Symmetry: D2
């Protein structure tokens, strides 16, 4: 089911400080290689009155390349697929909850995302759009409650210098029982490859890979 080259389609319904929007996208990648790209477009509520960056990481777990000896949980879940949940805790008080459903369709992945962002200060980096993409990150994963959980200490680069910090807490839930891995790490690097002027059309590229701690 999981071919060496695959594509997906995504749809997102979001709310950021009372502001509604919807996004639609299409992406594709190399599941076994840990590469993926997606092209999104704001189909409703655009142009966004906030930093696109907070939405970026919400657009593909099946493409994480894993070592032989680390169970490939998300993949294994195929083809019934899995669900994903997330909490984003911003240093200035901003809180985001995300819920996503991942399926297989006609050979194509289908991502459905729900997103709620609240408590972002009107003058902060998200509402004032002062962010300039994320630094590359390392997620710490572990099995818990019969599912796969992971946390990341991420940071957005600030247009005028410095960083705006965000802690990610995520939950990966196979739709059918599948083998869980142990304590591991996932290195990621997401880049906004291009976008129109008002961020109503954006393209991203993500490089992501699973592994053990270097000192092991």
């Amino acid at each position: 089911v999981i071919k060496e080259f695959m594509r997906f389609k995504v749809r997102m319904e979001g709310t950021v400080n009372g502001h509604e929007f919807e996004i639609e996208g299409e992406g594709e990648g190399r599941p076994y290689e840990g590469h993926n790209t997606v092209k999104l477009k704001v189909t409703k509520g655009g142009p966004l009155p906030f930093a696109w960056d907070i939405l970026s990481p919400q657009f593909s777990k099946v493409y994480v390349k894993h070592p032989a000896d680390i169970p490939d949980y998300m993949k294994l879940s195929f083809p019934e697929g899995f669900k994903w949940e997330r909490v984003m805790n911003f240093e200035d008080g901003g809180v985001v909850t995300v819920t996503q459903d991942s399926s297989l369709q006609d050979g194509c992945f289908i991502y459905k995302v729900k997103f709620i962002g609240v408590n972002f200060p009107s003058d902060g980096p998200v509402m004032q759009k002062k962010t300039m993409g994320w630094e590359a990150s390392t997620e710490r994963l572990y099995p818990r409650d019969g599912v796969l959980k992971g946390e990341i200490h991420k940071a957005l680069k600030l247009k005028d210098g410095g960083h705006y910090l965000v802690e990610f807490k995520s939950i990966y839930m196979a739709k059918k029982p599948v083998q869980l891995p142990g304590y591991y790490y996932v290195d990621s690097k997401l880049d906004i490859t291009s976008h129109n002027e008002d961020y109503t059309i954006v393209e991203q590229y993500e490089r992501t890979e699973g592994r053990h701690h270097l000192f092991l």
Copy 2:
């Protein structure tokens, strides 16, 4: 616009640990008296596989009775009305984000709610339904970022003894500039007055009042 006896209608679209649902309700109360009731019904995704209690507080700020000398922010916002946002931080890791829109229609209030609950342990009190209503609470309010903010240290009563703690962080945003109050408190008491067997039809009653700290 704000008559001494009013009614409202509510609709909620929610997600709890991957589980979708929709609720519809109708309530009514005495805005100046700080009393309100609502009757809800699960119109989609029922019966809920989780504690109804976590949804309860999401079903009416305009009914808070305020003292003469404390600006009545939510009321004042009428009739354009206001928006409300919330974060619920559960002691076991559960996180909920809520976004709500409040309007005036034909003399009737209209509440629209979006809700995302994630990271609730499968064996915890929410997913296992071991809760038995909330204790009465005291919210600490203050003006910030040109809006009204409030926090509460709440607790759900556990069927078998003890409490499950939840911290509420809320943001109230007038749709038009209106007078903000200073540092104050709001005492609340929400009761599930009745419900069918599978919590698909529920009725609540809430008593809520604004005030200054007792020692002032």
Copy 3:
């Protein structure tokens, strides 16, 4: 043991962002009335390079006046007395942990405090001394783990307007088993009554009382 008028002595060893200090004090009050005062003096590391306010609440649980029907936990612990622990979570990242021992001596209470404050931004309100006392507060108490626990959403008044928020989490531990109360509240009001120029000599007055939620 707990006379209607009593006095205590206190000593504190603290650290705030790498800065050591010691304080010594003497206070006295009316345990049954919920009033107490203390006079402190910086005996080491003064004058403090930070806001005195963060130290204030660390200087007397036995003086909380309680209603007849609410067990008087701290008092009951007498005369073996009890221990108290606390976490202070500041909105800008500042974190404080406090550990205190309370005893009875020759008819006089004896408070011993250890205090560690870290992660306070160099330009924030604590390190820049922009605070102007606390607003009056309401602590939410409950029995847990065989002890008494309480949380408060507190706020320091800012010299130039606005508030700096702090969440208190405290643990009260009787040195001998004594009767615990249920879910209750404690209203407090602490005032810096006077102080020398460089805050090396300060006097505070605290009014504190236990009670049930108003709507009960």
Copy 4:
């Protein structure tokens, strides 16, 4: 000042849920190689009624091996040295604040540590000693407030399976202005190499190295 082989001495005064203790130790290592060992002994309040593991990471930043192009902040601070501060946030509510002073003496490093642990559930893994060492970790570092800050998502291995999670937040402060680095990572692996029966005498070995994100 920083020879290729150096040794240090450490002393710690701590408090864990009302329990006092003091530790003294001696260690030594290869600063440029990122290796260090220390041998500790409980000199006061032993045997500890809690998991030794929570104390372990508190016993040597100067030994982190850094790449050529990543400023060696802690080292550079020599010989005036630096201070370090930390917050440890345990998933079950446990909170620890630590403050440490690092100096150079007669060619030997001198570490002074203050430690306050509070809110650990009586039946949790720390108070019941169910931990079995830490997994290896990755700290995310960045310059902020003119100092070096870092966060880690760490985990203690549980004797009977599973993990107990802890988030570390640390602050590194050069005693004299020195060059700060940018956004980087530090991989660590701390092992309890041996200990007596009642953890009153323990030896640890730590391997730690600085680097850039793999995908850079």
